[PDB]
Write a protein that binds this DNA or RNA. Structure first.
Ligand SMILES: [Mg+2]
Ligand SMILES: [Mg+2]
Lengths: 202, 128, 70, 169, 150, 76
RNA sequence: CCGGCAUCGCGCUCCUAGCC
């Protein structure tokens, strides 16, 4: 035998420190923490991270026109991720500061009507979250164990505060999107390396 | 400080308004069970269970998401088969749906069965 | 299940937290039935050893006195 | 059937030295055969009242016996209680809280399952108006009575008319 | 909450589901009856007796072992006290407080507490007369209250 | 709903939240409708999806994530 | 919607009292 795709994702996410949470736990994020160490930091159920990653992927793939998806990151560690995620899946990346009124102000030049919205962290990307609730836009977010879950539909539980975790999660979302779209055929051969997604510090 | 069938129904309104699927009523009685039977037979709740550890009792109710408000008329007035009409105008949202629960010597039952069986009694509550 | 952490009376079916235990001293290996939250200084009838101590919670056994929940 | 089980009960005192000082002492009121699901049958016995602690004292090495001195089908043992109809609108007759439907059916519950000890109950009210009395037995004494559970429900449907299912924690 | 304070504690005992005595309790109803009467004749009220049988002789609850409440056991053998236990103890505390009060007449906190205890005594005595556990003529004297107890 | 002569006289029977059964009104702009796709075999996607609606109440409590998680666990 | 029974429905001499 070999390792199943679920096992390999578990290995990689465990290598990228995705399993390693924070000291606190939001109660709505409590359905995803497995246990807490003497350090005080929680450990995330990676099997439930993978299950939510599947659910998110099946929601993303059903979008008939991928240009109707907006991906976004206010943090500096998630720029290079959300760009390549947008470039291999065909969605629209916006990295950095979000302009208030992008989703609710029709006369703005920066004005979009996204059918879906993906967020690195509910804490720092709270402006697009609030603007979503005014435009009937479902939202997928990467939620640490201290992430507020107001106005987020699909939450992937993970450490979103590390350099390798953000990259590996976005790489791994992209992989499933391509698999279900059929551009990656059955057989794990996909040639884009996870090192493309970690950001580069000049 | 207790007069149950108010705590039960108000716990149910609060739980239903928060969208919970299970509600727990600590002190039970035959009156509460008889009321909940009318609720179920008219379709506003799912099935429910009595948990007897020993004591007054305990029950858990399964909420179907279709009840809007269920309350008690404490100070249970005396209610004859002719002034049913005016209570249901004062207390129900329309002539088409909603029920007033009355305790009668023929059991606990809703006002419509009371009209058919031609019996009055004392009002316990309502739900709609 | 997490009921074991809940209060004694707030469980789905109420239950006590105390137990009766079979206790054994050293100088007289008979077995005495004693209650986890004693409230009394108790001495075994044979050896006359002081056996447990009343506290605010569960009774404090004395040195080297084995017990079994039962 | 009353008399064939009367005969089966009447002479076990021969042999089985260890059963003496038990069955020289006790007539049964009645015993009836009743059908459990699957064309299997079973039997119920009614000790009157005064000797229920006697039967419950042993209730194992003789209940096996009536599956070897009868060896066709199951038997169960209960004690006959009188149920009184509720006193009329006030008649100055108090009806002690025993011989009340609730207490009597709780006794038949406690004795039909006698080997085990009852540890919990639940009363489920199905949507259309069916009612189920689920009972949790002690998890010990489990390979003694797990196959008469369908029998136990069949027994309870007869003399109390209730739908009880059994289970363990 | 508490009748005469704002405390709202819920600390109390929780009896088990199981009505029957435990498997390991082997003592017979007559021996327990004998222990209860022996401690009673020595002067122990039903609460102290229950504490004794819990602690020394491994009786969880008499009503589970013997089937009868300990007060009923004491009544059947003609040994229940004439003044019920809780009223006895309230009377004794009121007497103690009053005895303290004649030595400290400016201690107004104890005067307040004396009022509270006599209030509790009157309420419990009302109950006892209503339910025929006291003569319908029993009434509580501040003066001749130490003669009754202790 | 229905006229007594059989006719249907309401216009636009509203959607109902799939978690709480509340009505999703015309002006409730915090509600969303999710279409999650069905993977079957080679290719792992055709235009087959199941749809779930969430009203602004649930989404504003935060319980949208738990409710969606529990509603996706239905097997067919 | 309800009468009339039967389950493990404290009695009748006397008024009404079905063909036991
Ligand atoms: Mg309180
Ligand atoms: Mg007060």
């Amino acid at each position: 035998r070999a390792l199943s795709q679920k096992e390999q994702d578990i290995q990689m996410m465990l290598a990228a420190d995705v399993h390693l949470g924070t000291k606190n736990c939001d109660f709505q994020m409590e359905r995803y923490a497995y246990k807490r160490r003497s350090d005080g930091i929680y450990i995330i159920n990676l099997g439930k991270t993978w299950e939510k990653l599947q659910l998110a992927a099946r929601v993303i793939v059903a979008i008939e026109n991928p240009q109707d998806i907006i991906v976004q990151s206010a943090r500096p560690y998630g720029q290079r991720a959300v760009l390549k995620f947008a470039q291999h899946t065909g969605a629209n990346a916006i990295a950095g500061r979000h302009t208030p009124g992008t989703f609710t102000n029709q006369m703005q030049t920066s004005f979009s009507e996204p059918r879906l919205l993906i967020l690195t962290d509910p804490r720092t990307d709270h402006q697009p979250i609030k603007e979503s609730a005014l435009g009937n836009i479902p939202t997928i977010a990467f939620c640490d164990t201290d992430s507020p879950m107001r106005y987020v539909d699909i939450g992937i539980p993970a450490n979103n505060k590390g350099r390798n975790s953000i990259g590996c999660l976005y790489w791994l979302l992209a992989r499933m999107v391509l698999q279900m779209r059929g551009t990656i055929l059955p057989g794990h051969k996909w040639d884009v390396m996870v090192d493309l997604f970690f950001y580069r510090d000049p | 400080g207790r007069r149950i069938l108010n705590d039960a129904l108000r716990t149910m309104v609060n739980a239903e308004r928060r969208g919970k699927a299970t509600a727990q009523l600590q002190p039970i009685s035959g009156v509460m069970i008889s009321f909940l039977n009318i609720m179920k037979h008219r379709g506003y709740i799912k099935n429910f269970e009595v948990f007897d550890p020993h004591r007054v009792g305990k029950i858990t109710v399964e909420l179907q998401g279709r009840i809007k408000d269920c309350k008690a008329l404490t100070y249970r007035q005396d209610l004859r088969a002719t002034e049913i009409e005016k209570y249901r105008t004062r207390m129900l949202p329309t002539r088409q749906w909603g029920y007033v629960v009355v305790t009668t010597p023929n059991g606990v039952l809703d006002h419509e069965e009371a009209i058919r069986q031609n019996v009055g009694g004392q009002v316990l509550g309502y739900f709609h | 299940e997490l009921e074991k952490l809940k209060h004694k009376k707030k469980r789905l079916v109420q239950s006590p937290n105390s137990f009766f235990m079979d206790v054994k001293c050293q100088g007289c290996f008979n077995i005495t039935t004693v209650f986890s939250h004693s409230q009394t200084v108790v001495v075994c009838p044979g050896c006359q050893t002081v056996l447990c101590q009343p506290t605010g919670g569960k009774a404090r056994l004395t040195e080297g006195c084995s017990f079994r929940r039962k | 059937f009353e008399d064939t089980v009367a005969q089966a009960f009447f002479d076990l005192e021969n042999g089985n030295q260890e059963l003496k000082s038990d069955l020289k002492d006790l007539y049964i009121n009645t015993a009836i055969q009743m059908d459990v699901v699957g064309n299997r049958k079973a039997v119920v016995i009614h000790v009157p009242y005064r000797l229920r602690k006697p039967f419950r004292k042993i209730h194992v090495r003789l209940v096996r016996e009536l599956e070897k001195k009868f060896s066709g089908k199951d038997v169960v043992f209960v004690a006959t209680r009188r149920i009184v109809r509720p006193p009329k609108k006030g008649s100055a007759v108090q009806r002690p809280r025993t011989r009340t439907l609730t207490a009597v059916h709780d006794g038949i519950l406690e004795d039909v399952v006698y080997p085990a000890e009852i540890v919990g109950k639940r009363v489920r009210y199905r949507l259309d108006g069916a009612k189920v009395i689920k009972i949790y037995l002690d998890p010990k004494e489990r390979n003694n009575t797990e196959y008469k559970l369908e029998t136990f429900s069949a027994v309870y449907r007869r003399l109390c008319g209730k739908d009880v299912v059994f289970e363990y924690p | 909450g508490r009748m005469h304070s704002r405390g709202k504690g819920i600390s109390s005992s929780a009896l088990p589901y199981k009505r029957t005595p435990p498997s390991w309790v082997k003592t017979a109803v007559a021996d327990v009856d004998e222990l209860i009467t022996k401690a009673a004749k020595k002067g122990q009220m039903p609460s102290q007796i229950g504490v004794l049988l819990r602690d020394q002789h491994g009786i969880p609850l008499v009503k589970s072992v013997t089937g009868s409440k300990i007060l009923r056991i004491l009544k059947a053998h003609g040994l229940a006290p004439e003044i019920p236990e809780d009223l006895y103890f309230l009377i004794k505390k009121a007497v103690a407080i009053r005895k303290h009060l004649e030595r400290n007449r400016k201690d107004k906190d104890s005067k307040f507490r004396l009022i509270l205890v006599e209030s509790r005594i009157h309420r419990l005595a009302r109950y006892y007369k209503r339910t025929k556990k006291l003569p319908p003529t029993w009434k509580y004297e501040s003066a001749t209250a130490s003669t009754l107890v202790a | 709903m229905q006229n007594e002569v059989g006719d249907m006289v309401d216009l636009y029977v509203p959607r109902k939240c799939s978690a709480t059964n509340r009505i999703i009104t015309a002006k409730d702009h915090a509600s969303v409708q999710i279409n999650i796709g069905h993977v079957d075999e080679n290719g792992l996607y055709d235009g087959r999806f199941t749809t779930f609606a969430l009203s602004g109440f649930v989404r504003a409590q935060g319980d949208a994530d738990g409710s969606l998680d529990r509603l996706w666990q239905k097997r067919k």
